[PDB]
Design a protein around this ligand. Structure first.
Ligand SMILES: Cc1cc2nc3c(=O)[nH]c(=O)nc-3n(C[C@@H](O)[C@@H](O)[C@@H](O)COP(=O)(O)O)c2cc1C
Ligand SMILES: Cc1cc2nc3c(=O)[nH]c(=O)nc-3n(C[C@H](O)[C@H](O)[C@H](O)COP(=O)(O)O)c2cc1C
Ligand SMILES: O=C(O)c1cccnc1
Ligand SMILES: O=C(O)c1cccnc1
Lengths: 216, 216
């Protein structure tokens, strides 16, 4: 069943502009985005969900130059999700997280809450103060969300395609992302594929496990 | 249904060492590892699946020290997956990939294969030659694999826990990954939680959508 989803799922190359998500599906994809796991529950992300013609047109502006070939996808799909990562890990965000966990009832005592904050604060520093790779660290969490989203959407019976071929400088500018602390990394149009999706009937291809997998 | 899977899964803090994956499930998680999508279908990864007592112990060594809280999870879980990313993208691997799609029958003509090879190399060179984010780029694809794997495993009725808290240098050394061209990124113990898993009862917590998601 889930393996069936994983084996039949595919990157749609063309969407049917007349096929939309049901209001229920639309709510579900947002839930998928929100509840993805992340290191220390950092959730260093922001998402832009374009579902209107005007909204999608703005996103598609990022599909120019060498990426015009991805424009149709953004324009024709039902919903287009823009996965964004924070550009820097700050204490105000760290406090926001632990406070949400607290409001959600994950701490039986203030010291348990302090212990959690110190733990998160410890790995955040290791990345920003020591390794100096917090941008990459948070960007990795976003991709993990993307991975969770792609399988999820497929299990909902919806078509989608993860997109890296777009101009992030344009996309960020179009939504003032940098001046808000974020930068776009991946774009994911969602909907139903059209008869023009040649990849819907092509066999899936992956390297043999004897190359990529070792058992011990 | 898959939404329920997303809302119900949780990071397992303790596993029951007596609860092993069935031969079928052990095979499904590998299928899961293999079929994750990736940019350009480059599949810049290698997986180490430890299931014997000795193998899991070797992986566990990487958690000794400042990551002791993650050590038990690695010894008690039925299967422990180590997600590794290629450390550099070489033309041999690009050759291996495009030849697999060919063997799997994704190209109807030689020009199609060449055109695909050309497109894949254009983005590979962009990352290695122009952006020099070659390693981070492949690492991100591995995380996308992780995200897909965590949802999939959960939908399989299995417990798991993503782990960044481990010494990658130790792990890399134990399995001679550096000379092999890979580096460990995240460890994922899979199995069934024991009554010791205090996180199986705590409520899940996530930041509000009114701050993380913009609709247009
Ligand atoms: C992070 C990421 C970015 C990618 N970019 C694009 C893109 O810009 N345009 C496109 O047509 N496909 C894109 N792909 C789609 C596929 O090339 C890869 O998912 C496919 O070759 C492996 O196939 P399948 O997804 O149908 O299973 C990307 C995939 C991932 C995971
Ligand atoms: C890449 C990554 C690394 C993480 N590392 C660890 C770890 O080293 N130890 C641990 O106990 N939990 C670890 N977590 C689990 C989380 O703190 C958890 O994903 C999060 O707080 C949200 O809770 P949930 O997974 O139960 O939904 C990690 C999560 C991700 C995605
Ligand atoms: O999310 C956690 O608890 C965590 C993440 C990285 C390292 N150690 C712990
Ligand atoms: O997988 C692709 O086809 C792809 C990935 C990144 C950028 N452009 C195309």
């Amino acid at each position: 069943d889930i393996i069936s989803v994983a084996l039949k799922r595919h990157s749609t190359k063309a969407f049917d502009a007349s096929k939309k998500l049901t209001p229920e599906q639309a709510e579900q994809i947002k839930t998928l985005l929100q509840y993805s796991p992340s290191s220390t529950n950092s959730q260093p992300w922001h998402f832009i969900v374009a579902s209107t013609e005007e909204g999608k047109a703005r996103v598609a502006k990022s599909a120019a130059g060498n990426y015009v070939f991805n424009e149709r996808k953004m324009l024709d799909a039902s919903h287009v999700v823009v996965f964004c990562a924070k550009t820097a890990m700050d204490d105000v965000w760290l406090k926001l997280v632990v406070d949400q966990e607290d409001a959600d009832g994950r701490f039986a005592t203030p010291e348990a809450k302090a212990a959690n904050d110190k733990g998160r604060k410890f790995f955040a520093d290791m990345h920003r103060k020591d390794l100096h790779d917090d941008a990459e660290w948070m960007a990795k969490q976003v991709y993990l969300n993307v991975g969770n989203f792609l399988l999820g959407v497929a299990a909902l019976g919806l078509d989608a395609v993860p997109i890296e071929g777009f101009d992030a400088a344009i996309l960020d500018a179009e939504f003032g992302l940098k001046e808000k602390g974020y930068t776009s990394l991946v774009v994911v149009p969602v909907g139903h594929h059209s008869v023009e999706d040649f990849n819907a009937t092509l066999p899936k291809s992956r390297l043999p496990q004897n190359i990529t997998l070792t058992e011990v």
